[PDB]
């Protein structure tokens, strides 16, 4: 009878870069056919060099963000250093597996700058499998968004086309466009896009407006 989960929708995207990492997300929380709110950004800033993006049951996302935030503080107190992006990813993997038996329905993407100063994106399955990936789209529109990023960012299935390292500008243009496409064809995604760019200076938040349904 009681179903412990509902799909609150949303899509998250993260694009790494030689020196930058971009994590972006919709701002609409939708339960069923209704739109609960059109301003609920799904990107949260864990530390200066890392942003987490979560989509799925919102209730799980709120709890997970609170848990990760707490644990980050505990790492800081105990180890007297900030958690790196790599560490947050491993900790999240363990946290998610803790509930393998009654799971957190959250698709999570952590994007950030690594110790070398390069940008790293870590993508996690709901039960915590984690892979470092150059670009990843998660959420309701992962299916729609991922193929485009793979052709454009990964130059896959393209013959006789040169490979150019992505630039913050080309990527911002690409992220805005892919989300525009999803707004049109995925009912869940829409309202607005928050793009968070993590660079050595720090997270910068830019909001653009996607079509209200």
């Amino acid at each position: 009878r009681f179903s412990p989960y509902v799909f609150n929708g949303g899509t998250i995207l993260a694009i790494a870069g030689e020196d930058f990492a971009i994590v972006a997300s919709d701002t609409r929380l939708s339960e069923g056919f209704s739109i609960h709110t059109r301003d609920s950004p799904k990107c949260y800033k864990l530390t200066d060099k890392t942003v987490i993006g979560c989509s799925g049951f919102h209730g799980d996302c709120l709890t997970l963000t609170k848990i990760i935030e707490a644990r980050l503080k505990m790492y800081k107190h105990s180890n007297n250093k900030a958690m790196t992006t790599g560490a947050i990813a491993a900790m999240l993997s363990t946290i998610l597996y803790s509930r393998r038996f009654f799971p957190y329905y959250v698709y999570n993407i952590i994007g950030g700058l690594d110790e070398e100063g390069k940008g790293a994106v870590y993508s996690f399955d709901p039960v915590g499998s984690y892979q470092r990936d150059s670009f990843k789209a998660g959420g309701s529109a992962s299916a729609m968004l991922q193929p485009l990023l793979d052709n454009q960012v990964g130059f896959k299935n393209m013959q006789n086309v040169e490979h150019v390292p992505l630039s913050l500008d080309r990527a911002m243009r690409l992220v805005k466009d892919v989300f525009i496409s999803a707004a049109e064809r995925d009912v869940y995604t829409g309202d607005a896009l928050r793009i968070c760019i993590v660079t050595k200076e720090g997270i910068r938040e830019e909001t653009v407006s996607l079509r209200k349904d």
Binding site: K66, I67, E69, A70
Partner: peptide, 10 residues
Amino acid sequence: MRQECLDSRF
């Protein structure tokens, strides 16, 4: 004390 503070924020 640290745990009590962390608890309040959560």
